[PDB]
PDB file of all heavy atoms in Angstrom:
ATOM      1  N   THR R 201     -30.775 -43.914  46.490  1.00 59.54           N
ATOM      2  CA  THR R 201     -31.548 -43.422  45.388  1.00 59.54           C
ATOM      3  C   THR R 201     -33.043 -43.853  45.523  1.00 59.54           C
ATOM      4  O   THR R 201     -33.887 -43.023  45.281  1.00 59.54           O
ATOM      5  CB  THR R 201     -30.882 -43.841  44.149  1.00 59.54           C
ATOM      6  OG1 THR R 201     -29.556 -43.436  44.089  1.00 59.54           O
ATOM      7  CG2 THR R 201     -31.754 -43.222  42.964  1.00 59.54           C
ATOM      8  N   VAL R 202     -33.270 -45.118  45.930  1.00 61.17           N
ATOM      9  CA  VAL R 202     -34.602 -45.695  45.928  1.00 61.17           C
ATOM     10  C   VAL R 202     -35.378 -44.908  47.117  1.00 61.17           C
ATOM     11  O   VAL R 202     -36.555 -44.825  47.014  1.00 61.17           O
ATOM     12  CB  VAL R 202     -34.604 -47.236  46.215  1.00 61.17           C
ATOM     13  CG1 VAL R 202     -34.010 -47.624  47.459  1.00 61.17           C
ATOM     14  CG2 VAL R 202     -35.996 -47.768  46.127  1.00 61.17           C
ATOM     15  N   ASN R 203     -34.734 -44.513  48.150  1.00 61.09           N
ATOM     16  CA  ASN R 203     -35.406 -43.782  49.196  1.00 61.09           C
ATOM     17  C   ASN R 203     -35.773 -42.324  48.786  1.00 61.09           C
ATOM     18  O   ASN R 203     -36.660 -41.802  49.321  1.00 61.09           O
ATOM     19  CB  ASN R 203     -34.513 -43.917  50.512  1.00 61.09           C
ATOM     20  CG  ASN R 203     -34.593 -45.070  51.124  1.00 61.09           C
ATOM     21  OD1 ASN R 203     -35.141 -46.158  50.590  1.00 61.09           O
ATOM     22  ND2 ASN R 203     -33.966 -45.127  52.300  1.00 61.09           N
ATOM     23  N   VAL R 204     -34.895 -41.751  47.896  1.00 59.78           N
ATOM     24  CA  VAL R 204     -35.260 -40.388  47.406  1.00 59.78           C
ATOM     25  C   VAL R 204     -36.497 -40.410  46.579  1.00 59.78           C
ATOM     26  O   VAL R 204     -37.420 -39.585  46.634  1.00 59.78           O
ATOM     27  CB  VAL R 204     -33.945 -39.891  46.621  1.00 59.78           C
ATOM     28  CG1 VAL R 204     -34.467 -38.545  45.909  1.00 59.78           C
ATOM     29  CG2 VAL R 204     -32.825 -39.577  47.553  1.00 59.78           C
ATOM     30  N   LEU R 205     -36.588 -41.456  45.702  1.00 58.94           N
ATOM     31  CA  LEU R 205     -37.781 -41.508  44.754  1.00 58.94           C
ATOM     32  C   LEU R 205     -39.067 -41.692  45.589  1.00 58.94           C
ATOM     33  O   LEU R 205     -40.082 -41.159  45.278  1.00 58.94           O
ATOM     34  CB  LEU R 205     -37.487 -42.623  43.815  1.00 58.94           C
ATOM     35  CG  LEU R 205     -36.493 -42.387  42.766  1.00 58.94           C
ATOM     36  CD1 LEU R 205     -35.984 -43.740  42.093  1.00 58.94           C
ATOM     37  CD2 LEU R 205     -36.912 -41.460  41.692  1.00 58.94           C
ATOM     38  N   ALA R 206     -38.943 -42.603  46.501  1.00 57.05           N
ATOM     39  CA  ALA R 206     -40.102 -42.828  47.396  1.00 57.05           C
ATOM     40  C   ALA R 206     -40.445 -41.578  48.173  1.00 57.05           C
ATOM     41  O   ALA R 206     -41.662 -41.331  48.357  1.00 57.05           O
ATOM     42  CB  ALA R 206     -39.850 -44.037  48.463  1.00 57.05           C
ATOM     43  N   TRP R 207     -39.562 -40.740  48.584  1.00 55.58           N
ATOM     44  CA  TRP R 207     -39.859 -39.508  49.256  1.00 55.58           C
ATOM     45  C   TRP R 207     -40.447 -38.475  48.281  1.00 55.58           C
ATOM     46  O   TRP R 207     -41.117 -37.667  48.697  1.00 55.58           O
ATOM     47  CB  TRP R 207     -38.541 -38.995  49.909  1.00 55.58           C
ATOM     48  CG  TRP R 207     -38.734 -37.538  50.498  1.00 55.58           C
ATOM     49  CD1 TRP R 207     -39.313 -37.188  51.756  1.00 55.58           C
ATOM     50  CD2 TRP R 207     -38.190 -36.469  50.014  1.00 55.58           C
ATOM     51  NE1 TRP R 207     -39.278 -35.888  51.870  1.00 55.58           N
ATOM     52  CE2 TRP R 207     -38.570 -35.297  50.917  1.00 55.58           C
ATOM     53  CE3 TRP R 207     -37.435 -36.110  48.896  1.00 55.58           C
ATOM     54  CZ2 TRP R 207     -38.168 -34.028  50.660  1.00 55.58           C
ATOM     55  CZ3 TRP R 207     -37.155 -34.744  48.657  1.00 55.58           C
ATOM     56  CH2 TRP R 207     -37.447 -33.756  49.526  1.00 55.58           C
ATOM     57  N   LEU R 208     -40.029 -38.552  46.957  1.00 53.87           N
ATOM     58  CA  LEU R 208     -40.670 -37.797  45.967  1.00 53.87           C
ATOM     59  C   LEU R 208     -42.220 -38.210  45.767  1.00 53.87           C
ATOM     60  O   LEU R 208     -43.022 -37.323  45.416  1.00 53.87           O
ATOM     61  CB  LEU R 208     -39.895 -37.802  44.740  1.00 53.87           C
ATOM     62  CG  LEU R 208     -38.602 -37.147  44.615  1.00 53.87           C
ATOM     63  CD1 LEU R 208     -37.910 -37.241  43.263  1.00 53.87           C
ATOM     64  CD2 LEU R 208     -38.669 -35.689  44.922  1.00 53.87           C
ATOM     65  N   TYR R 209     -42.405 -39.508  45.817  1.00 52.83           N
ATOM     66  CA  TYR R 209     -43.815 -39.947  45.750  1.00 52.83           C
ATOM     67  C   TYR R 209     -44.643 -39.492  46.850  1.00 52.83           C
ATOM     68  O   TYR R 209     -45.826 -39.031  46.714  1.00 52.83           O
ATOM     69  CB  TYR R 209     -43.832 -41.478  45.618  1.00 52.83           C
ATOM     70  CG  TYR R 209     -43.565 -42.010  44.257  1.00 52.83           C
ATOM     71  CD1 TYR R 209     -42.349 -42.733  43.964  1.00 52.83           C
ATOM     72  CD2 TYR R 209     -44.588 -41.973  43.282  1.00 52.83           C
ATOM     73  CE1 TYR R 209     -42.134 -43.197  42.735  1.00 52.83           C
ATOM     74  CE2 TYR R 209     -44.269 -42.479  41.982  1.00 52.83           C
ATOM     75  CZ  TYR R 209     -43.144 -43.106  41.765  1.00 52.83           C
ATOM     76  OH  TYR R 209     -42.823 -43.595  40.422  1.00 52.83           O
ATOM     77  N   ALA R 210     -44.044 -39.467  48.100  1.00 51.96           N
ATOM     78  CA  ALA R 210     -44.756 -38.832  49.235  1.00 51.96           C
ATOM     79  C   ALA R 210     -45.052 -37.432  49.032  1.00 51.96           C
ATOM     80  O   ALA R 210     -46.208 -36.916  49.502  1.00 51.96           O
ATOM     81  CB  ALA R 210     -43.860 -39.091  50.480  1.00 51.96           C
ATOM     82  N   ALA R 211     -44.154 -36.696  48.277  1.00 52.32           N
ATOM     83  CA  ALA R 211     -44.596 -35.288  48.052  1.00 52.32           C
ATOM     84  C   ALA R 211     -45.708 -35.125  47.040  1.00 52.32           C
ATOM     85  O   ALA R 211     -46.530 -34.299  47.199  1.00 52.32           O
ATOM     86  CB  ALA R 211     -43.268 -34.588  47.512  1.00 52.32           C
ATOM     87  N   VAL R 212     -45.683 -35.982  46.009  1.00 54.94           N
ATOM     88  CA  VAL R 212     -46.785 -35.973  45.106  1.00 54.94           C
ATOM     89  C   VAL R 212     -48.127 -36.312  45.696  1.00 54.94           C
ATOM     90  O   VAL R 212     -49.197 -35.730  45.508  1.00 54.94           O
ATOM     91  CB  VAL R 212     -46.470 -36.834  43.827  1.00 54.94           C
ATOM     92  CG1 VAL R 212     -47.661 -37.000  42.922  1.00 54.94           C
ATOM     93  CG2 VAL R 212     -45.343 -36.239  43.046  1.00 54.94           C
ATOM     94  N   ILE R 213     -48.098 -37.333  46.602  1.00 51.77           N
ATOM     95  CA  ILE R 213     -49.203 -37.761  47.301  1.00 51.77           C
ATOM     96  C   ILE R 213     -49.756 -36.514  48.189  1.00 51.77           C
ATOM     97  O   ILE R 213     -50.989 -36.359  48.355  1.00 51.77           O
ATOM     98  CB  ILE R 213     -48.956 -38.913  48.241  1.00 51.77           C
ATOM     99  CG1 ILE R 213     -48.821 -40.198  47.366  1.00 51.77           C
ATOM    100  CG2 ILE R 213     -50.048 -39.152  49.223  1.00 51.77           C
ATOM    101  CD1 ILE R 213     -48.163 -41.280  48.114  1.00 51.77           C
ATOM    102  N   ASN R 214     -48.831 -35.610  48.673  1.00 53.11           N
ATOM    103  CA  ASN R 214     -49.180 -34.555  49.562  1.00 53.11           C
ATOM    104  C   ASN R 214     -49.418 -33.280  48.702  1.00 53.11           C
ATOM    105  O   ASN R 214     -49.565 -32.187  49.243  1.00 53.11           O
ATOM    106  CB  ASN R 214     -48.167 -34.360  50.630  1.00 53.11           C
ATOM    107  CG  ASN R 214     -48.335 -35.241  51.730  1.00 53.11           C
ATOM    108  OD1 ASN R 214     -48.937 -34.874  52.757  1.00 53.11           O
ATOM    109  ND2 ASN R 214     -47.829 -36.408  51.602  1.00 53.11           N
ATOM    110  N   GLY R 215     -49.442 -33.386  47.380  1.00 50.48           N
ATOM    111  CA  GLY R 215     -49.675 -32.191  46.516  1.00 50.48           C
ATOM    112  C   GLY R 215     -48.582 -31.268  46.230  1.00 50.48           C
ATOM    113  O   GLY R 215     -48.683 -30.313  45.556  1.00 50.48           O
ATOM    114  N   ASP R 216     -47.246 -31.630  46.602  1.00 50.19           N
ATOM    115  CA  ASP R 216     -46.120 -30.941  46.280  1.00 50.19           C
ATOM    116  C   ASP R 216     -45.499 -31.468  45.038  1.00 50.19           C
ATOM    117  O   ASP R 216     -44.913 -32.578  44.982  1.00 50.19           O
ATOM    118  CB  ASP R 216     -45.108 -31.036  47.391  1.00 50.19           C
ATOM    119  CG  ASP R 216     -44.298 -29.747  47.572  1.00 50.19           C
ATOM    120  OD1 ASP R 216     -44.296 -28.903  46.742  1.00 50.19           O
ATOM    121  OD2 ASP R 216     -43.688 -29.593  48.721  1.00 50.19           O
ATOM    122  N   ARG R 217     -45.849 -30.811  43.853  1.00 49.80           N
ATOM    123  CA  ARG R 217     -45.615 -31.351  42.538  1.00 49.80           C
ATOM    124  C   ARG R 217     -44.868 -30.548  41.647  1.00 49.80           C
ATOM    125  O   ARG R 217     -44.964 -30.684  40.452  1.00 49.80           O
ATOM    126  CB  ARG R 217     -46.984 -31.829  41.942  1.00 49.80           C
ATOM    127  CG  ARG R 217     -47.803 -32.708  42.991  1.00 49.80           C
ATOM    128  CD  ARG R 217     -48.829 -33.452  42.273  1.00 49.80           C
ATOM    129  NE  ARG R 217     -50.249 -32.898  42.488  1.00 49.80           N
ATOM    130  CZ  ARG R 217     -51.136 -33.680  43.168  1.00 49.80           C
ATOM    131  NH1 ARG R 217     -51.008 -34.896  43.610  1.00 49.80           N
ATOM    132  NH2 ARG R 217     -52.282 -33.054  43.345  1.00 49.80           N
TER     133      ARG R 217
END
Side-chain angles (χ1 to χ4, degrees):
Chain R
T201 306
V202 64
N203 286 8
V204 172
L205 292 161
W207 174 77
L208 288 180
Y209 279 108
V212 171
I213 291 165
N214 280 268
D216 215 346
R217 306 200 254 242

